[PDB]
Amino acid sequence: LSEYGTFCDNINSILDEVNGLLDTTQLHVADTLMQGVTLSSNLNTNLH
Amino acid sequence: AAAGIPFSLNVQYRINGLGVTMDVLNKNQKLIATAFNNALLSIQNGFS
Amino acid sequence: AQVQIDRLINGRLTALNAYVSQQLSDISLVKFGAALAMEKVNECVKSQ
Amino acid sequence: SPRINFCGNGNHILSLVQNAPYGLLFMHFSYKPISFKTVLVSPGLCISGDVGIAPKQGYFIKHNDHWMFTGSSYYYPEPISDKNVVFMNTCSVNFTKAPLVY
């Protein structure tokens, strides 16, 4: 396999790029959900 | 996240924008709120 | 043994290439879906 | 277009475009608040013959003991008029009672 060449490096590189796209996408979705959200410090989960 | 106004008023103005008079909307506010939380419960029970 | 192992290396590397190509194609659809979800957040939840 | 976060984040005013290597560079100009005043607002009023009024892109404010209107993005109390109001034949519950308006 080591005498085969850069095949495994190319497989790892494409999967790393795909996973980086998924990570960047998750950050963009989270940014979109949190964009412009202003909340009061008086909010409580047990009463409101 | 509700155009700077109470959620119930946003629901009422959104229903009014469809061609529904505000007179039936502000007198049926309890019926509209019950229809809304019943729709939410229908979505929740739909996962069963 | 090198001839036999070489046939397995070639088959397994071909399989990884096929899986990687499919994964790139699938992540394109995931990015399209994430863009639609961000658009629905912005234009259906935060505003109408 | 009336799409809130399509042209960048925040209160989008206008956008401009410039050429970029392999694409376009958009400059999104947004309205950014610098300082804020905490004020007591009413989302609607019940006035005169129980007629409901709602503010257009703003709020009703008690200023100088009198009911006034202000825009939601800039504090500037101005008189309540048909220009900054949505009328209703009946007022909704919890709309502040203001019989002395109009």
UniProtKB/Swiss-Prot annotation, chain D:
UniProt superkingdom: Viruses
Carbohydrate attachment residues: 94
Role summary: Acts as a viral fusion peptide which is unmasked following S2 cleavage occurring upon virus endocytosis.
Protein name, entry field: Spike protein S2'
Organism: Human coronavirus HKU1 (isolate N1)
Residues of the full protein shown: 1122 to 1223 of 1356
